């Protein structure tokens, strides 16, 4: 039944279309000036409510479907399926960096051109910023990773702010600890995976529990199916309020089209050439085809700008057309999603090749391999804290030491960069599924 | 076994009224003097201890029986059943709300008298306040609808405060969005409806999770048996409390008294005309028998001033008592709650009529129906927010312009009305469980 | 098998040995100098995630364990045993304060020496503080008891901070409530015990509710078993971290040697003597065995000075290794961590008795008796707030008037005592798990 099979996909692009129409209409019919911030807030609003929406259920969704996931195959096959995925997202992510250093070499974005000019985005207030120590943030990281109570866990993680109690003299800024807000997804990962695990441990006291947790999860995929016919309003709405929250006539475009192009092109050869490739090497079956088959969920992270909020209907969009096993599926992508970031690594890695290529730095070989692997680990540094878009730059330019001077140039061109990124991440997550269940299959 | 069936009754009438003796003899004794703050404390501390054991069960309650109740019936009968609910609930607060016109318009409350001064009710601090647009109360209502997160929804409601990030030039504030304190029971309601919808949706795989939230809202109602048999005592020292924490010997009801009776008066119409002769019309059985089958929760109400508190009371003693369905008890007297304040929006119209009596205001026809339709839709508006007890009577005349410069006196006496708006939004949840269950019934 | 059962006896005793001997060495080396805070972070980090992990699961283990305990003896046999325990920790408590006051009266460790002087320690900051007052910190006991919501009570506790709210005249401080960071396990206890009384009060309804909380629980336990192998190393980690964060060569020591070895012996003979002794005049079983079988939890409270973290690796050892019943060991353990608290009572009592003893003051008969009730109330009322390690003893000086201008003298040497005193008092809730488990099994 093609013409209800693919209606969905019909529908999605046709709101990504619409929505950007309506956007670019109403900026040059006179967008703000004609709408007042009332009317900006109402006509964002439907994008508001489908991340509402989406951040409802991520919680529940992953945590009973890594509760139910874990505890289907014995200890010893998901350490392996474990390993062999961690692994697998690690050299996906590596490999979008390489490939990010590799065309921002190349294509030269920071070439003698307007972007040089660094005033008017900066102004002062890049240099003024927390200024978090890598030290720092792997620690938060691994305490985000065993939270200190669950509940508070569901929505807040630990973040390091940095005091003054240091007037005894040479003044110094020392760490202190204070939950802020965010969703501790990684910590309820870790718990629910170690959860599962316990309950395969046991044997008939743990039925009961893991059928609560699947019969749980069957109900919020059932939400996610009303969840997602609403999405094409709520994806229109907000890609017209985030073009009409800032003119794209042109003039960004022409600032930074080559550090922009870039960085798109790197996510489309990581997402249709590289992943494609690996998919047809292993498994032998047709990726162009799988990639089809997962057309909602892209374009639902091409509007959201979230791996969060695109993968209540990427699993079920997975678990349902494609041929993916249930377990594999649920083990797999939440842990695909708060982990690979492949398009993150990838546009990090390009942002400090092109501020390094602004100034004419050298970055030879060892600078090279240190953004690689400060971007590999960044890619799930940056994945516990949402606030933390392209925040997670300032600490890799700390530790290798390059002019952070301008790095507010990225944040007014941020939303639409962080749009592919979504899509490549929630990509390569199915990907790696895909493979590990034909790899579990054989 | 009528001594052993209406101990309770007589327990907490006689507690209301030995409180209200307690507190009279107390504030003519010395009150304050002879007590202090201290005592204050200790004096009012039952009822606030009342107030946290019945608030700490409306989460449990509420949550696990919409979701035993919304599957209970098919999604058909459900969705017919709730649109005339709504229907239902939006009739009897817009009928309210014309009778408090028609009472206000005929007393005249604001005549020429004491109430006309407010230099020491205001003292200029009325103006200053947040000044919330109704626009903005809309969507803080729908976004707590559709909450962010649940666990923070079992604690935190969305409240869109002001600040003043337009210094480029002609300063305006804009709304950012802050999660406050107080529970989103409307985004609880929510998405337990849906969850039981999905579950019924589901067959045999949401057997076990039906049964286990019967089985913990059964818990909690044996609770709520043991919170009952407390209540009077937390009922006497709260009312003692609460007119020992201000002198009524008569000053401000000899200031007030047209309104006040004004406001009673429209309850009590409501409360023993109105919905008793629409249950008569449609269910041909005795209204006033039921409504002394609920004497226990209206007398709580009267105390707390909350419907917060007194719906699991009253929950119990409609399943119990009345012969009223379970499930239709259970889908349909927490909407209730969230949803009818029927003496919410006929004070606060009342309110309004009298103040703009005072200072002689038009209000022809026009003006008439906007305040019952914001009334009617407010009703709504200030459910998901405790604290705004009348605070939504701003936003109301921000929308139609009237002065505000005297909103404060109604908080000197916003202790006395509310408690006969709480029992009166009681009721009327009850006569639309009544009303529905022999609709069903037939 | 001695070889595999004694292994992690004798793995925590040398954790314990060998992070003092690291400890001791980093700070005879250099220490700090040496080391930096960000390589002190990095070398306490291990036990702040042993910290992390051990907090993480009390809520689960506490709330799911009282449940399944509650509910396993009818409501008659319930009151029985929690009466009975609880004038077992009244007694225990009250013996331990005695204790402390002959000891520190015969010891006399406030004679004049070093310990007079405390400019360096108070410097004019330790009068300014909230200066709680007795019947404020009782009224938040017993509101952090019958929480507000059970969701916040998960990681907040109640707090009554002082504004200055009487600017009409004569400022005095008046209370307000704003809830604060800390979990509510008073509440959440007292909810759980409730809860599954309730759910012996129903009966089919109910069992698949108990199977659900014993089954998570399970669980719970079977994570309780890799953290406890984790352990060692956490706390090697957290004891070098403790011991180089302040000097230890001898000056505290020499400073306060009469004081910390009136604690300490106090603590062995409450331990060692008292405890076992009655344990030993009603099982009639050898009570210094039952304290080998329980090593491994006590040198856990040494190195962690929380009792809230030792919890669980105690309930699975006193279930596992000792033949205590499971039921009573739900039941009674975790009332036992949240109320008994022996050690806190006791060097409470020798902290206020040894402020006394200089400045020489009488404390003849009723102060001693003041000192002792006191004491016994706060070993509850310090439990609820984790943060007051110490700080309960400045209301009781408050209740009885001493100087409170010294007493920042023990916050340098709190760090030693605390670890001792949470030794006892889980030793105190298991010699009363034993003891009612014998006398249920009569
Ligand atoms: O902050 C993030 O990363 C940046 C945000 N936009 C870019 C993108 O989303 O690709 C990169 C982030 C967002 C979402 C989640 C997530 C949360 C719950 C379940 C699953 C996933 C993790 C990390
Ligand atoms: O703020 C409110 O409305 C005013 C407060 N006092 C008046 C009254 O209670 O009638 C009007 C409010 C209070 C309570 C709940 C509620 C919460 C949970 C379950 C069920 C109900 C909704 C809204
Ligand atoms: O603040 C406390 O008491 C002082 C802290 N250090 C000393 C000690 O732990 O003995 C005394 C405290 C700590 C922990 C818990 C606790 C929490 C959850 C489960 C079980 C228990 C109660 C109260």
Redesign the interface.
Known sequence: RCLRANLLVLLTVVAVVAGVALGLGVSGAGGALALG??RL??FV?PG??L???L??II??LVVCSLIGGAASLDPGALGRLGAWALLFFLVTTLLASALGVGLALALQPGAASAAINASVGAAGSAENAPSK?V??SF?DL??NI???????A??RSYSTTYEERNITGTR?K??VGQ?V?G?NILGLVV?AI??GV??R??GP??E??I??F???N???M??VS?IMWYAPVGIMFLVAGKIVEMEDVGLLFARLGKYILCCLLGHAIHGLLVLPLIYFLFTRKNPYRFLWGIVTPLATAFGTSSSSATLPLMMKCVEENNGVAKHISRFILPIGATVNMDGAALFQCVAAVFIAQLSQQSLDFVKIITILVTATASSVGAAGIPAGGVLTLAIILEAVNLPVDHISLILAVDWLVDRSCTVLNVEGDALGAGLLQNYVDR
Chains 1, 2, 3 share one sequence.
Do not use: I, Q
């Not at 065993?146 to 508070?152: A, E």
């Open positions: 911030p009332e807030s109402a609003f508001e409510l991340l509402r929406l951040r409802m919680l529940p120590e030290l720092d620690l691994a305490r065993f939270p200190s109570n669950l509940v508070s569901a929505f110094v020392v760490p939950e807000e969703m718990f170690v959860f316990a309950l441990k046991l006291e743990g009961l529990l059928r609560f699947n019969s749980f069957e109900a919020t059932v939400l009303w």
